[PDB]
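Thread: Modeling a multi-component assembly for a lab meeting

Hi all, long-time lurker, first post. My supervisor asked me to bring a structural picture of a complex we are working on to next week's group meeting, and I have zero experience with this. I have the sequence lines for every component (225 residues in total). Could someone generate the structure of the whole assembly? Inputs are pasted exactly as I received them:
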Amino acid sequence: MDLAPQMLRELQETNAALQDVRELLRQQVKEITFLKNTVMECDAC
Amino acid sequence: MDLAPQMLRELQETNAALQDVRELLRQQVKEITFLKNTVMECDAC
Amino acid sequence: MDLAPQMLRELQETNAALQDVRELLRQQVKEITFLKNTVMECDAC
Amino acid sequence: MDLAPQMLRELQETNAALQDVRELLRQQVKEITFLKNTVMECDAC
Amino acid sequence: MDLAPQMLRELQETNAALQDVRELLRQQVKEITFLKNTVMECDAC
Ligand SMILES: CCCCCCCCCCCCCC(=O)O
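Re: Modeling a multi-component assembly
Sure thing. I ran the full set together rather than chain by chain. Output:
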């Protein structure tokens, strides 16, 4: 129906891109939390 | 009418992921801030 | 019934969450820049 | 009532917010990269 | 005035910027990971 089909595909791609960003961020948070504890447990500090 | 139901669904899933990203970012800045504070008080520095 | 009003609401909710994300990120960069400068002045280094 | 005009405005606001998010992420990655290298050449390591 | 064409262009712009955000995030996670590992093999601690 006109551009509706095209718009729906764009929305689907956005949702897919979002899922990946979500996974990346969840991975980044773990690394950051790890870094935090590591420096937090540094003897020289 | 039209692909309205389909489009709405994609928007709903996107918002669900976006709300998750916001909370993830919320937690991350908190960890980063604690990491910053720890380094600021690091005697080695 | 008509789903247009509901679609508009979803879009409005997206922008609200996206705005919070922009604000958090803005703060995070500031925190990361502070962390960087602190490390640059860390004597042990 | 045609909600297309209002929907368009929301989509436009979304892109404006995304542009700010991308610009912020660009500067953030630069700060983190600089932090990485600074720790790499840190004497006490 | 039909706004569908313009709305489609907005959706495409959203996916373009999001892909940029994703590319930057995956690079950043790599930089953060490098930072994490460098701190782990840092003698000072
Ligand atoms: C309608 C599309 C939804 C908007 C997409 C949201 C993009 C947010 C990316 C978050 C960036 C994370 C930055 C960070 O803390 O490292």
